[PDB]
Design a protein around this ligand. Structure first.
Ligand SMILES: [Zn+2]
Lengths: 55, 54
């Protein structure tokens, strides 16, 4: 529940809580950097890739 | 779209596609191992942790 969380929309807050996302690590592509659903989806996809490639 | 996907419920299939989840890697806790939403959530949370420690 950091600054990124304060600035996120209720729906994005909820998604980040559900899946353990630190929104400070997500690159927002909305207006003025606002985090969009597809931004969290891209972050999660890439995390899963790196995790499955890791030993 | 593997066998794990074939056996998953429509909402779990949609979730796996949206977040790039290989459902064969998710341990289901529903009846007979059916994958539940909270299982996908747990898998994603731990994946993020594993990706950071790498
Ligand atoms: Zn602020």
């Amino acid at each position: 529940e950091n600054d990124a969380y304060v600035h996120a929309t209720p729906l994005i807050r909820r998604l980040a809580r559900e899946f353990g996302v630190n929104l400070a690590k997500v690159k927002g592509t909305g207006r003025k950097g606002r985090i969009l659903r597809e931004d969290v989806q891209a972050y999660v996809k890439e995390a899963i890739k790196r995790a499955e490639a890791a030993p």
